Amino acid sequence: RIKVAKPVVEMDGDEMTRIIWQFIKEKLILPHVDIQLKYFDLGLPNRDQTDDQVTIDSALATQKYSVAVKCATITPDEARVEEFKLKKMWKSPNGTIRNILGGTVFREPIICKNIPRLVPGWTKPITIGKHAHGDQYKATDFVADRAGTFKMVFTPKDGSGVKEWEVYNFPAGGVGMGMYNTDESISGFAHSCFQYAIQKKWPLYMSTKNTILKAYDGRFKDIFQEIFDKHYKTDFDKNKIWYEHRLIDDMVAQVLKSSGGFVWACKNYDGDVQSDILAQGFGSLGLMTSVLVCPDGKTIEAEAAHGTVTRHYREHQKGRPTSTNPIASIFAWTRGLEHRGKLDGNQDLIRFAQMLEKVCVETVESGAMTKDLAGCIHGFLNTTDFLDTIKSNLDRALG
Amino acid sequence: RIKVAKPVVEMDGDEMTRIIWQFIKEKLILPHVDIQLKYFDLGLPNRDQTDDQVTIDSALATQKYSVAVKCATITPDEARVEEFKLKKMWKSPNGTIRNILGGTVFREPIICKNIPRLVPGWTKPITIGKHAHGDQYKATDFVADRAGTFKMVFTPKDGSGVKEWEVYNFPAGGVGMGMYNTDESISGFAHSCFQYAIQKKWPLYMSTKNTILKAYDGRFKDIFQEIFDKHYKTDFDKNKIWYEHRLIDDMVAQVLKSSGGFVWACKNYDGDVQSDILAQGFGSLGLMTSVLVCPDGKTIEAEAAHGTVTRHYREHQKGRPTSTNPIASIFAWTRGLEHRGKLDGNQDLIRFAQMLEKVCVETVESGAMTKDLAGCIHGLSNLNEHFLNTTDFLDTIKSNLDRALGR
Ligand SMILES: NC(=O)C1=CN([C@@H]2O[C@H](COP(=O)(O)OP(=O)(O)OC[C@H]3O[C@@H](n4cnc5c(N)ncnc54)[C@H](OP(=O)(O)O)[C@@H]3O)[C@@H](O)[C@H]2O)C=CC1
Ligand SMILES: NC(=O)C1=CN([C@@H]2O[C@H](COP(=O)(O)OP(=O)(O)OC[C@H]3O[C@@H](n4cnc5c(N)ncnc54)[C@H](OP(=O)(O)O)[C@@H]3O)[C@@H](O)[C@H]2O)C=CC1
The missing domain is CATH 3.40.718.10 (Isopropylmalate Dehydrogenase)
Known part of the structure; x- marks a missing residue:
C-alpha cells in the first residue's frame, strides 16, 4: 500500500457514474493507496442542500491541494427540479469549477487495439x-415574455464614452442572452x-x-x-x-x-x-480522458468527458443490469494520481496509476468489455462484472 | 427549350463557386430552359460598391418570385477587408437573406453508389x-478594450418593469456579445x-x-x-x-x-x-443539397452547403488546374427549377431538373469525378490519374446531359 504525502480533492457525482466511482475508490484505489482524500459531495441532493456552496468549496480546495478527481454530475433543468425537488436550477458544477480554476481541458481517446x-x-x-x-x-440568458427593446451597454471604469447597442426590438415573445x-x-x-x-x-x-x-x-x-x-x-x-x-x-x-x-x-x-x-x-465515450490544466501549470482536475449516463441509470432504477464503461472514470483517478505522484516525486504512485491504466486497456484487448465496445466489434459484460474483471486483473498484475 | 412563365432569382457569388456557377447557367441551364432570371451579383466587389443593398434587394425579390438560386459568397473579416479593400466588414449575405426570409434550411447528402x-x-x-x-x-458583439461593466437592458414596450443583468465586470480587455x-x-x-x-x-x-x-x-x-x-x-x-x-x-x-x-x-x-x-x-462537401424553406410554405432558396472554396481558387489564381466538385452547385439550380416547376405546374421543367440531377449521380457512378470523390476511393495522398479537373468534369456533365436529352 503506497503512502501519499499530500491530499487529492475528490468530487463525488451522480447516477450511474456515482455507482462506478464508489467501486473505483473503495475497490481499486484505497486497497493499494494510503491517500488522504478531501471529499466533496457534488451529488445533486448535496448541491441543493448546501445551495451549491459545496461546488465552490471543492474548487477552492483544488486551488489549494493542486489535484482534483471529478465524477460526472447532473446539471439541472426544469425536469430535474421536479425529479429531485430542488430549490432552483443550479448552475453546472463543471462551469463553476472551470471558471474558478481556469485553463484548458485536454481531451483525447483511450486507444484499445481490438476496438474498431x-x-x-x-x-x-x-x-x-x-x-x-x-x-x-x-452566459446570462432570459425569456422575454413581451414586446420590448433588448440593449447592451458597456460602462468603462475609466469613465470614458459609454457604449450602447440595440440588440433587438422584440415584436413579441422570445429569448435573449449575453x-x-x-x-x-x-x-x-x-x-x-x-x-x-x-x-x-x-x-x-x-x-x-x-x-x-x-x-x-x-x-x-x-x-x-x-x-x-x-x-x-x-x-x-x-x-x-x-x-x-x-x-x-x-x-x-x-x-x-x-x-x-x-x-x-x-x-x-x-x-x-x-x-x-x-x-x-x-471507439466510445467510455474511452476518452479529460484533464483541466490550470494556467499556473500545477493545478489539475481530471474527469471523464461523458455525463452521469442517465439512460443506463434508468435501467438500474428498474432493477435491470447495465453495461456502462468505467474506463474513463478509472482514468480520472489514475491521471489525478499520476499528477499527485509527479508533484510529490512519488515514483511508486505514478507506477501504480500507469499500471491501472494498462490493466484497463489489457482487459479490453483480452476480449472482456462492456456493450458500448462490443457494439464496435459486432454491432459483453455487465457493469459490475466488467469492474470485477478489472479488480481481478489489477490484483493479478500486482504480482 | 423549356418555356418558363414565372422568374427565378439568381444570386451570383464569389471565387471558385462563381466560375462553376457561370458554366452551370450558360452551358447547362440556359441552352435548355427559356427562363427570366432576376439577376443579383452578390459577389463581394458588388456588395461593397452597393453598400450591401444588392443582398437586401435579392432577398426581397425572392419573397416576390418565391424562388432563389444562390452561389456561395465570401463573408468578409479583417483579412478580406485588406484583400478587397472594403468600406467595412459586411455581414454574411446568408445571414441577411436568411433573416429576411426566415425558415428552416434542410440539408441532406447527394448519394453516389460507388462513393465510400x-x-x-x-x-x-x-x-x-x-x-x-x-x-x-x-448577434451584437464587441471588443472591450478596457475595464468596465457589461450589462443587458430589457425595456418592455408596455411600460412595465425595466430589467437589468450584469453579464460581467471586465477587470481588463475582453469580448462581449448579445x-x-x-x-x-x-x-x-x-x-x-x-x-x-x-x-x-x-x-x-x-x-x-x-x-x-x-x-x-x-x-x-x-x-x-x-x-x-x-x-x-x-x-x-x-x-x-x-x-x-x-x-x-x-x-x-x-x-x-x-x-x-x-x-x-x-x-x-x-x-x-x-x-x-x-x-x-x-462522401463530400460537394455532395450535399441545401434548401431554405420559408414559413409561408411557398418561398424557397436553394444553395450548396459549402463555401466559395478559396483554397482551390488560390491555385486557380496561380494558373494551376483545380478539381472542385460542382454537383452541390448544380443541385442548387435543379432544386430551384424543380420548385418553380411545382408552383407553376410545368412538368417539363420538373423532368429536366430531375434529369440533370440523375446525370450528376450517373457521371460519378460511371467513374468520372473530381479529386474530393476520387480521394474517397484511392486516398487523398495516393491521385492525378483518377480525377478530372473542374472544367473537364463540367464538360463531362454537359456531354452526359446532351446524351440524356437525346433519348
Ligand atoms: N462533465 C459532466 O459532468 C457532464 C454531465 N452531464 C450530465 O449528465 C446527464 C446525462 O446526460 P446525457 O446527455 O445522457 O449524456 P451522457 O454522456 O451521460 O450519456 C449519453 C449517452 O452516451 C453513452 N455513454 C456515455 N457514457 C458512457 C459510458 N461511460 N459507457 C457507455 N456508454 C456511455 C450512452 O449511450 P447509449 O444510451 O446509446 O448506450 C449514454 O446514454 C445530464 O444530467 C447532464 O447534465 C453531461 C455531460 C457532461
Ligand atoms: N453559404 C456560403 O456562402 C458559405 C460561404 N463561406 C465562405 O467561403 C469562404 C471559404 O471558406 P472555407 O472555410 O474555406 O469553406 P469552403 O467550404 O469554401 O471550403 C473548405 C474546404 O472544403 C472542401 N470543399 C468545399 N467545397 C468543395 C467542393 N465544392 N469541391 C471540393 N472540395 C470542397 C475543400 O477542402 P480541401 O481544401 O481539403 O480540398 C475546401 O478547401 C469564406 O470566405 C467563407 O466566408 C463559407 C461557408 C458557407
Missing part, C-alpha cells in the same frame, strides 16, 4: 484543447495549446466562426496569431510543425477526412461537442 | 433541419421539422444545450415539446415514428454511431457545423 473505429481513417489519436472559461458556461470572454483567459488558452503542440511535435489548428462573430471570435484568431508570431513561430519551425486557424464548418470536415495526429484548439462549446465526436469516432 | 463513406455505419441518409433565424447570425431568437421563429422551425419527419416517415431528434442555457435553449425544448403534444403526437404515433430532445454532446455521438434514417432539428450554429460533418461523412 466508427471513422476508420483516424489512424493516429487527436487531442482537443478545449477553452475552459467563459462563453455559454458564464456572454463574454477575457483577453487574459484566451491568452492562457493559446499558450497552453502552443506548449502542448510543441511537446507532442504535432501541428496545431484553432477553429472559430470569426466571419460571423467578427469581434468576439476575431479576438481568438488575433490573440492566437499574435502569441504564435511572438513566442512559438521559431519553435514550430524547428520541430517541423505548423499553426493554422480554420473556420469551424471547414475544420470539422477537415478532421473527419484526416488521419489524426494533431492538436485542435476548440472554443468552450465546440470543445464539448467535438470531443464527443472524437470519443465516439475512436 | 468516411463513416461506413451511415447506411441510410440523414436530413438536418437547421434553424435559419437569429442566434449568432443576428444575441436573440423569437417564439414565432422557433414555432415555425418546429412545425417545419415535424411535418418533414411525417412526410419522410422518419423519427425526429432535436438538439440543444438547455442544461447550460436554461432559459434560451429551454425555450427551444419547450416550444418543440408543446407543438408535438398539441399537433403531431397522433400523426407520429400512427406513422410508427417518434420525437426526442437530446443534449447536443450526446446527440452528435448518437449520430456518429447511428445507421442514419432520421431528421435532426439543429439550432442555427449546430446546423452549419453538423451539416458539414454529415456532408463529409457521406
Whole structure:
C-alpha cells in the first residue's frame, strides 16, 4: 500500500457514474493507496442542500491541494427540479469549477487495439484543447415574455464614452442572452495549446466562426496569431510543425477526412461537442480522458468527458443490469494520481496509476468489455462484472 | 427549350463557386430552359460598391418570385477587408437573406453508389433541419478594450418593469456579445421539422444545450415539446415514428454511431457545423443539397452547403488546374427549377431538373469525378490519374446531359 504525502480533492457525482466511482475508490484505489482524500459531495441532493456552496468549496480546495478527481454530475433543468425537488436550477458544477480554476481541458481517446473505429481513417489519436472559461458556461440568458427593446451597454471604469447597442426590438415573445470572454483567459488558452503542440511535435489548428462573430471570435484568431508570431513561430519551425486557424464548418470536415495526429484548439462549446465526436469516432465515450490544466501549470482536475449516463441509470432504477464503461472514470483517478505522484516525486504512485491504466486497456484487448465496445466489434459484460474483471486483473498484475 | 412563365432569382457569388456557377447557367441551364432570371451579383466587389443593398434587394425579390438560386459568397473579416479593400466588414449575405426570409434550411447528402463513406455505419441518409433565424447570425458583439461593466437592458414596450443583468465586470480587455431568437421563429422551425419527419416517415431528434442555457435553449425544448403534444403526437404515433430532445454532446455521438434514417432539428450554429460533418461523412462537401424553406410554405432558396472554396481558387489564381466538385452547385439550380416547376405546374421543367440531377449521380457512378470523390476511393495522398479537373468534369456533365436529352 503506497503512502501519499499530500491530499487529492475528490468530487463525488451522480447516477450511474456515482455507482462506478464508489467501486473505483473503495475497490481499486484505497486497497493499494494510503491517500488522504478531501471529499466533496457534488451529488445533486448535496448541491441543493448546501445551495451549491459545496461546488465552490471543492474548487477552492483544488486551488489549494493542486489535484482534483471529478465524477460526472447532473446539471439541472426544469425536469430535474421536479425529479429531485430542488430549490432552483443550479448552475453546472463543471462551469463553476472551470471558471474558478481556469485553463484548458485536454481531451483525447483511450486507444484499445481490438476496438474498431466508427471513422476508420483516424489512424493516429487527436487531442482537443478545449477553452475552459467563459462563453455559454458564464452566459446570462432570459425569456422575454413581451414586446420590448433588448440593449447592451458597456460602462468603462475609466469613465470614458459609454457604449450602447440595440440588440433587438422584440415584436413579441422570445429569448435573449449575453456572454463574454477575457483577453487574459484566451491568452492562457493559446499558450497552453502552443506548449502542448510543441511537446507532442504535432501541428496545431484553432477553429472559430470569426466571419460571423467578427469581434468576439476575431479576438481568438488575433490573440492566437499574435502569441504564435511572438513566442512559438521559431519553435514550430524547428520541430517541423505548423499553426493554422480554420473556420469551424471547414475544420470539422477537415478532421473527419484526416488521419489524426494533431492538436485542435476548440472554443468552450465546440470543445464539448467535438470531443464527443472524437470519443465516439475512436471507439466510445467510455474511452476518452479529460484533464483541466490550470494556467499556473500545477493545478489539475481530471474527469471523464461523458455525463452521469442517465439512460443506463434508468435501467438500474428498474432493477435491470447495465453495461456502462468505467474506463474513463478509472482514468480520472489514475491521471489525478499520476499528477499527485509527479508533484510529490512519488515514483511508486505514478507506477501504480500507469499500471491501472494498462490493466484497463489489457482487459479490453483480452476480449472482456462492456456493450458500448462490443457494439464496435459486432454491432459483453455487465457493469459490475466488467469492474470485477478489472479488480481481478489489477490484483493479478500486482504480482 | 423549356418555356418558363414565372422568374427565378439568381444570386451570383464569389471565387471558385462563381466560375462553376457561370458554366452551370450558360452551358447547362440556359441552352435548355427559356427562363427570366432576376439577376443579383452578390459577389463581394458588388456588395461593397452597393453598400450591401444588392443582398437586401435579392432577398426581397425572392419573397416576390418565391424562388432563389444562390452561389456561395465570401463573408468578409479583417483579412478580406485588406484583400478587397472594403468600406467595412459586411455581414454574411446568408445571414441577411436568411433573416429576411426566415425558415428552416434542410440539408441532406447527394448519394453516389460507388462513393465510400468516411463513416461506413451511415447506411441510410440523414436530413438536418437547421434553424435559419437569429442566434449568432443576428448577434451584437464587441471588443472591450478596457475595464468596465457589461450589462443587458430589457425595456418592455408596455411600460412595465425595466430589467437589468450584469453579464460581467471586465477587470481588463475582453469580448462581449448579445444575441436573440423569437417564439414565432422557433414555432415555425418546429412545425417545419415535424411535418418533414411525417412526410419522410422518419423519427425526429432535436438538439440543444438547455442544461447550460436554461432559459434560451429551454425555450427551444419547450416550444418543440408543446407543438408535438398539441399537433403531431397522433400523426407520429400512427406513422410508427417518434420525437426526442437530446443534449447536443450526446446527440452528435448518437449520430456518429447511428445507421442514419432520421431528421435532426439543429439550432442555427449546430446546423452549419453538423451539416458539414454529415456532408463529409457521406462522401463530400460537394455532395450535399441545401434548401431554405420559408414559413409561408411557398418561398424557397436553394444553395450548396459549402463555401466559395478559396483554397482551390488560390491555385486557380496561380494558373494551376483545380478539381472542385460542382454537383452541390448544380443541385442548387435543379432544386430551384424543380420548385418553380411545382408552383407553376410545368412538368417539363420538373423532368429536366430531375434529369440533370440523375446525370450528376450517373457521371460519378460511371467513374468520372473530381479529386474530393476520387480521394474517397484511392486516398487523398495516393491521385492525378483518377480525377478530372473542374472544367473537364463540367464538360463531362454537359456531354452526359446532351446524351440524356437525346433519348
Ligand atoms: N462533465 C459532466 O459532468 C457532464 C454531465 N452531464 C450530465 O449528465 C446527464 C446525462 O446526460 P446525457 O446527455 O445522457 O449524456 P451522457 O454522456 O451521460 O450519456 C449519453 C449517452 O452516451 C453513452 N455513454 C456515455 N457514457 C458512457 C459510458 N461511460 N459507457 C457507455 N456508454 C456511455 C450512452 O449511450 P447509449 O444510451 O446509446 O448506450 C449514454 O446514454 C445530464 O444530467 C447532464 O447534465 C453531461 C455531460 C457532461
Ligand atoms: N453559404 C456560403 O456562402 C458559405 C460561404 N463561406 C465562405 O467561403 C469562404 C471559404 O471558406 P472555407 O472555410 O474555406 O469553406 P469552403 O467550404 O469554401 O471550403 C473548405 C474546404 O472544403 C472542401 N470543399 C468545399 N467545397 C468543395 C467542393 N465544392 N469541391 C471540393 N472540395 C470542397 C475543400 O477542402 P480541401 O481544401 O481539403 O480540398 C475546401 O478547401 C469564406 O470566405 C467563407 O466566408 C463559407 C461557408 C458557407
